Design an enzyme around this catalytic site. Structure first.
Site, PDB file in Angstrom:
ATOM      1  N   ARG A 260       6.970 -14.019  37.967  1.00 49.84           N
ATOM      2  CA  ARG A 260       7.080 -15.273  37.375  1.00 49.84           C
ATOM      3  C   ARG A 260       5.621 -15.761  37.093  1.00 49.84           C
ATOM      4  NH1 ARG A 260       9.804 -20.708  39.928  1.00 49.84           N
ATOM      5  NH2 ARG A 260      11.863 -19.932  38.558  1.00 49.84           N
TER       6      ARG A 260
ATOM      7  N   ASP B  91      -7.501 -11.230  28.387  1.00 49.10           N
ATOM      8  CA  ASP B  91      -7.084 -11.399  29.640  1.00 49.10           C
ATOM      9  C   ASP B  91      -7.186  -9.855  30.463  1.00 49.10           C
ATOM     10  OD1 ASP B  91      -6.181 -12.742  31.726  1.00 49.10           O
ATOM     11  OD2 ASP B  91      -3.975 -12.711  31.422  1.00 49.10           O
TER      12      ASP B  91
ATOM     13  N   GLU C 257       9.016 -15.641  32.611  1.00 49.73           N
ATOM     14  CA  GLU C 257       9.814 -14.735  33.697  1.00 49.73           C
ATOM     15  C   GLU C 257       9.778 -13.334  33.249  1.00 49.73           C
ATOM     16  OE1 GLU C 257      13.030 -17.146  35.370  1.00 49.73           O
ATOM     17  OE2 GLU C 257      11.716 -17.329  37.050  1.00 49.73           O
TER      18      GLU C 257
HETATM   19  C1  LIG Z   1       6.531  -2.804  34.999  1.00 52.42           C
HETATM   20  O1  LIG Z   1       6.624  -2.324  33.709  1.00 52.42           O
HETATM   21  C2  LIG Z   1       6.202  -3.323  32.959  1.00 52.42           C
HETATM   22  C3  LIG Z   1       5.601  -4.539  33.290  1.00 52.42           C
HETATM   23  C4  LIG Z   1       5.405  -5.522  32.543  1.00 52.42           C
HETATM   24  C5  LIG Z   1       5.439  -5.263  31.113  1.00 52.42           C
HETATM   25  C6  LIG Z   1       4.862  -6.248  29.975  1.00 52.42           C
HETATM   26  C7  LIG Z   1       4.540  -7.496  30.505  1.00 52.42           C
HETATM   27  S1  LIG Z   1       4.425  -8.648  31.846  1.00 52.42           S
HETATM   28  C8  LIG Z   1       3.857  -9.997  31.132  1.00 52.42           C
HETATM   29  N1  LIG Z   1       3.533 -11.140  31.431  1.00 52.42           N
HETATM   30  C9  LIG Z   1       3.952 -11.447  33.088  1.00 52.42           C
HETATM   31  C10 LIG Z   1       3.282 -10.785  34.006  1.00 52.42           C
HETATM   32  C11 LIG Z   1       3.466 -11.338  35.347  1.00 52.42           C
HETATM   33  C12 LIG Z   1       4.740 -12.239  35.592  1.00 52.42           C
HETATM   34  C13 LIG Z   1       5.257 -12.768  34.314  1.00 52.42           C
HETATM   35  F1  LIG Z   1       6.379 -13.907  34.698  1.00 52.42           F
HETATM   36  C14 LIG Z   1       4.752 -12.384  33.485  1.00 52.42           C
HETATM   37  N2  LIG Z   1       3.624  -9.838  29.623  1.00 52.42           N
HETATM   38  C15 LIG Z   1       3.744  -8.271  29.145  1.00 52.42           C
HETATM   39  O2  LIG Z   1       3.668  -7.733  28.142  1.00 52.42           O
HETATM   40  C16 LIG Z   1       5.990  -3.846  30.735  1.00 52.42           C
HETATM   41  C17 LIG Z   1       6.082  -3.073  31.373  1.00 52.42           C
HETATM   42  O3  LIG Z   1       6.615  -1.684  31.184  1.00 52.42           O
END
Ligand SMILES: COc1ccc(/C=C2\S/C(=N\c3cccc(F)c3)NC2=O)cc1O
Length: 328
Positions: free
Chosen positions: A45, A154, A50
């Site tokens: 989150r 970022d 999320e």
């Molecule tokens: C485990 O595998 C993967 C994990 C993440 C993603 C892509 C993401 S996560 C994100 N933001 C977040 C980070 C942290 C918390 C939150 F609530 C949002 N933005 C993206 O593009 C793709 C995957 O295959």
């Protein structure tokens, strides 16, 4: 006023793209089928979303679903447009679908899944060769997105997903990314504190792709020196002081004088005077296996105050530090 600045590379990419490419406010989202995806478990989150592990029941494959918290639709379209522009690029996370979540009443972005190891445990196991290899793979992603007119803004370990078993890397979380337009002034409230470039910390808004190269240098320094984060400020003011204790205050003043920038007067009583240090002082018996003259030279050429003096992603890929990396 402040002296203007331009990117030294990829300056005009969006100028000569069709307007549809970068005009994300006019983008029309193509919605998929929300019932194709079944949420399995919550992974994280943030302030803006999320993230869940999920299953796409039309192929029984794992995906990752990011359900946005309510935010300016302009920023939602920006992230979607950027992900669609960059889809298929080297080591860029693949956006597979976009659906309307019925509970949140917001968009949900569906991504390919990466079986990743958390960086806190991965960074304790990576070898000198692993670090060079994965740094090269990050540079492929950054040269791609910069060449496509986009800055990530970022870059940090939490946004580099690594499946170490398959030596697979993806740059994720494009929610702060922006299109680069010459002469545009940008919000400086981007990046995580430890990875903010000096341009953000001195409130210089006309920055560019080179911000990502500072953040990458901060990552490299934390990995080769085994100190995470490397510049460990307790707030945005102390962050610049931490940097100045390494790069020195005289070159900080050269930097702000070049762009005719003034420091916040609150630095008058906290900044002090600091010589520039040699990187060898951070080498010790527990990290020397990760350090080489090539590594220190490469790091030195990323961590410059002047955003115009940093290696570009493409130049970085030419550096002798990567000579030992097996090319495919
Ligand atoms: C485990 O595998 C993967 C994990 C993440 C993603 C892509 C993401 S996560 C994100 N933001 C977040 C980070 C942290 C918390 C939150 F609530 C949002 N933005 C993206 O593009 C793709 C995957 O295959």
């Amino acid at each position: 006023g402040p002296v203007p600045s331009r990117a030294r590379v990829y300056t005009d990419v969006n100028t000569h793209r069709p307007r549809e490419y970068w005009d994300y406010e006019s983008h029309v989202v193509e919605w998929g089928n929300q019932d194709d995806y079944q949420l399995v478990r919550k992974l994280g989150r943030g302030k803006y979303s999320e993230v869940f592990e999920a299953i796409n029941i039309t192929n029984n494959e794992k995906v990752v679903v990011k359900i946005l918290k309510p935010v300016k639709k302009k920023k939602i379209k920006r992230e979607i447009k950027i992900l669609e522009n960059l889809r298929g690029g080297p080591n860029i996370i693949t956006l597979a679908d976009i659906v309307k979540d019925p509970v949140s009443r917001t968009p949900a972005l569906v991504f390919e899944h990466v079986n990743n190891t958390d960086f806190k445990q991965l960074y304790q196991t990576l070898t000198d060769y692993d670090i060079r290899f994965y740094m090269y793979e990050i540079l492929k992603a950054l040269d791609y997105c910069h060449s496509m007119g986009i800055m990530h803004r970022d870059v940090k370990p939490h946004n580099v997903m690594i499946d170490h078993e398959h030596r697979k890397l993806r740059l994720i979380d494009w929610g702060l990314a922006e299109f680069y337009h010459p002469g545009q002034e940008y919000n400086v409230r981007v990046a995580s504190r430890y990875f903010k470039g000096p341009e953000l910390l001195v409130d210089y808004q006309m920055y560019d792709y080179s911000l990502d190269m500072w953040s990458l240098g901060c990552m490299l320094a934390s990995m080769i020196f085994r100190k995470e984060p490397f510049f460990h400020g307790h707030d945005n003011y102390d962050q610049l002081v931490r940097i100045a204790k390494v790069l020195g205050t005289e070159d900080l003043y050269d930097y702000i004088d070049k762009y005719n920038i003034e420091l916040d007067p609150r630095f008058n009583d906290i900044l002090g005077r600091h010589s520039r240090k040699r990187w060898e002082r951070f080498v010790h018996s527990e990290n020397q296996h990760l350090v080489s003259p090539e590594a220190l030279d490469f790091l030195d050429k990323l961590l410059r105050y002047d955003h115009q003096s940093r290696l570009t992603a493409r130049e970085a890929m030419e550096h002798p530090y990567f000579y030992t990396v097996v090319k495919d």
